[PDB]
């Protein structure tokens, strides 16, 4: 009855999260969970939105790595993420480019 009697009574508020195909498995294997949880579709952000996110996270990266990030750099990460990493969704794809680039600067400092 994992979470069951409580979810069924409005008690034990639970916020779940999973991947579309994982969900598919929930729906097929249990079914009743789909009747216990309210599905909320989460949408991939656009490039513009992705950049806004990156700007917001920019200080976490600058502080962590000890680097300064140009705004055009973040725009670039989002554009390149969409164009060159088509199989992986934008939030991480852009962040990987930003985070790794920042890391590279830091690593490079210790290379000399």
32: contact with ligand ATP by CB under 6 A: yes
Are the C-beta atoms of residues 3 and 36 closer than 8 Å to each other? yes
Q: 3-class SS at 16?
A: coil
By the 10 Å C-beta count (0-12 exposed, 13-18 middle, 19+ buried), 35 is classed as exposed
Residue 85 interacting with a second copy (CB under 8 A): no
- Figure out which of the listed residues 78, 90, 94, 102 binds a second copy, where binding follows CB under 8 A: 102
Print the binding letters for residues 13-42 with a second copy: x by CB under 8 A, - otherwise: ------------------xx--x-------
> Could you say whether residue 106 binds a second copy (CB under 8 A)?
yes
Could you give the CA distance from residue 99 to residue 102 in angstroms, rounded to a whole number? Answer: 5
Among 24, 35, 88, 109, binds ligand ATP (CB under 6 A): 35
Binding site for a second copy (CB under 8 A): 1, 31-32, 35, 61, 64-65, 95-96, 99-100, 102-104, 106-108, 110-112
């Amino acid at each position: 009855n994992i979470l069951k009697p409580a979810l069924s009574r409005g008690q034990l508020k639970v916020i779940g999260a999973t991947t579309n195909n994982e969900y598919r498995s929930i729906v097929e294997k249990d079914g009743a969970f789909e009747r216990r949880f309210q599905k909320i579709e989460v949408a991939e952000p656009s490039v513009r939105q992705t950049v806004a996110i990156l700007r917001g996270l920019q200080p976490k990266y600058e502080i962590h790595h000890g680097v300064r990030i140009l705004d055009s750099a973040l725009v670039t990460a989002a554009q390149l993420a969409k164009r060159y990493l088509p199989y992986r969704r934008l939030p991480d794809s852009a962040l990987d480019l930003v985070d790794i680039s920042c890391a590279g600067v830091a690593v490079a400092r210790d290379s000399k």
